[PDB]
Amino acid sequence: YFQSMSVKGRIYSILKQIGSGGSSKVFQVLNEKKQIYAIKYVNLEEADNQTLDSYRNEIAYLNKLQQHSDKIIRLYDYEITDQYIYMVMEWGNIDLNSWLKKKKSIDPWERKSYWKNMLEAVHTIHQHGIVHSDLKPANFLIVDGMLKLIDFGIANQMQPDTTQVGTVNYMPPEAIKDSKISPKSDVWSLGCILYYMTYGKTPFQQIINQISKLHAIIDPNHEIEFPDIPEKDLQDVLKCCLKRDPKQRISIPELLAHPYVQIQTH
């Protein structure tokens, strides 16, 4: 029940575990001033040089980029050694994958406000050359009704083995047809998340067969349902995000000047 750890001399008191993946554990902890944080611990015992440089790189970027937007998660401090990495981060109520897994109805205002957070955070990483290229709702954390981007998909996702889960619902068609990596790949994946918040599922979610789903994502003859809704700006945004051709698909800077994001509906 009572557990503890240090990170750069400062003592944190572990309350519980709030995450896991590969050889990393996220804990909900309290510092000496009874302030709540999330420490991500990562193990390097069997991680190769590539893997380690991927973690070092991600860290450096996350640290740098938090200044540039407040829609990226705070990395308050970290402790990096040959054996492990602690990262003392901003603690959030719940991730968006779990939040949307609760709710059927999402408040139009809340959806738009989330959409904006997502655009801003993702735009920031793009501005420093980073395409995420694996954006899911899992990647976004709700901190006081504000969505923070948890990670940049820079680090190499090593598997547990002794014991969200590689889902292709958010996968852009260019990725499925196999070096080059367009920032508009992320626009598709964001579009898929918004499509979820708009219509209740991802566009190819109803496709039960895996190989079929992949095929459907690419097949231009295979249309996507955009059932008409009061928010016609929302319907517009989704159609523009989910163009299969990356060159015809809308840009982040464009999505930011879009009526959905700018026009005040009251």
Ligand SMILES: CCc1cccc(CC)c1NC(=O)c1nn(C)c2c1CCc1cnc(Nc3ccc(N4CCN(C)CC4)cc3OC)nc1-2
């Ligand atoms: C997707 C990002 C990623 C990439 C690579 C490696 C990792 C580490 C496993 C990660 N994961 C994280 O870096 C991470 N995952 N979570 C859940 C958090 C982080 C870092 C920051 C952070 C801050 N605050 C929270 N709070 C929180 C979130 C979710 C939940 N849950 C519990 C499990 N349920 C199934 C869903 C709801 C509980 C939380 O705390 C109360 N949660 C978090």
